Amino acid sequence: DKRRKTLVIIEKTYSLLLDVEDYERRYLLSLEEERPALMDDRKHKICSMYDNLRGKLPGQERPSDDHFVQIMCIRKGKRMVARILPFLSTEQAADILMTTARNLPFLIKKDAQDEVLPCLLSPFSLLLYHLPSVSITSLLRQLMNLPGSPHLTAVLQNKFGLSLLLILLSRGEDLQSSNNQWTEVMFMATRELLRIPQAALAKPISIPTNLVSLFSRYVDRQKLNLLETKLQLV
């Protein structure tokens, strides 16, 4: 089975990760003459890392999600990606987040025994603050464009999935409080949060404080209370 091959790729890539994580130490203890070389090496190893996750073979204009998905179904794989994220450019990191969203229900299924998906919440949250509104909207659009739509049961019932959804909504709120397209996905989201039975909802890792303010824009008082109770909102 390839799962053996995947574990190999994980070990290969994880080794690069430890090197890049050790970089500041080496640079700090280096002679000036060595620094140019240290910097080039760092660059190529970060490229290599991204390529092992999201590289594409000849004849394809977009990478296959295969390799990324395979890695993300493995305990150490998810923890590795969490630690690679901070080293990637914003554009590379957003790709990883969009790919995660596109494949989220399957990744959730494959995380049922390990439950390590939450290790990605922190780096994704840091990333979200660096992303514009078009991006925030596109990610939410992808989450609502999965099998079962417009029902998001698998996501809402998952600690990481719910938390991630709440972080996205929160950041979207920020950006709008600075268009209508954002308003459309917001309506869908509140509808879905309103539908899901409270007993089914996962316990969110964190609850953004601006959520109440966000929901007020699209929903009346009676329903607002529902959400607040449902999500133990602040």
Considering beta carbons, is residue 4 or 221 the nearer one to K ion? 4
CB of 6: closest distance to K ion in angstroms? Answer: 4
Per CB under 5 A, contacts with K ion among 51-80 are: 67, 70
Asked if 9 interacts with K ion (CB under 5 A), we say yes
CB of 49: closest distance to K ion in angstroms? Answer: 13
Q: What is the DSSP letter of 219?
A: S
Q: What is the DSSP letter of 119?
A: G
Per CB under 5 A, contacts with K ion among 146-165 are: none
- What phi and psi, each to the nearest 5 degrees, are found at residue 149? -50, 145
What is the rounded distance in angstroms from the CA atom of residue 156 to the CA atom of residue 227? Answer: 13
Residue 48 buriedness (CB in 10 A; 0-12 / 13-18 / 19+): middle
CB of 80: closest distance to K ion in angstroms? Answer: 11
Considering beta carbons, is residue 9 or 175 the nearer one to K ion? 9
Asked if 171 interacts with K ion (CB under 5 A), we say no
What is the rounded distance in angstroms from the CA atom of residue 13 to the CA atom of residue 35? Answer: 23
Considering beta carbons, is residue 12 or 217 the nearer one to K ion? 12
107 touches 100 (CB < 8 A):
yes
Structure tokens at 42: 């760092």
Asked if 13 interacts with K ion (CB under 5 A), we say no
CB of 69: closest distance to K ion in angstroms? Answer: 9
Considering beta carbons, is residue 11 or 21 the nearer one to K ion? 11
Asked if 103 interacts with K ion (CB under 5 A), we say no
CB of 98: closest distance to K ion in angstroms? Answer: 19
Buried/exposed code over 208-222 (b: 16+ C-beta within 10 A; e: otherwise): beebeebbeeebeee
The residue ranges that bind K ion (CB under 5 A) are 6, 9, 67, 70
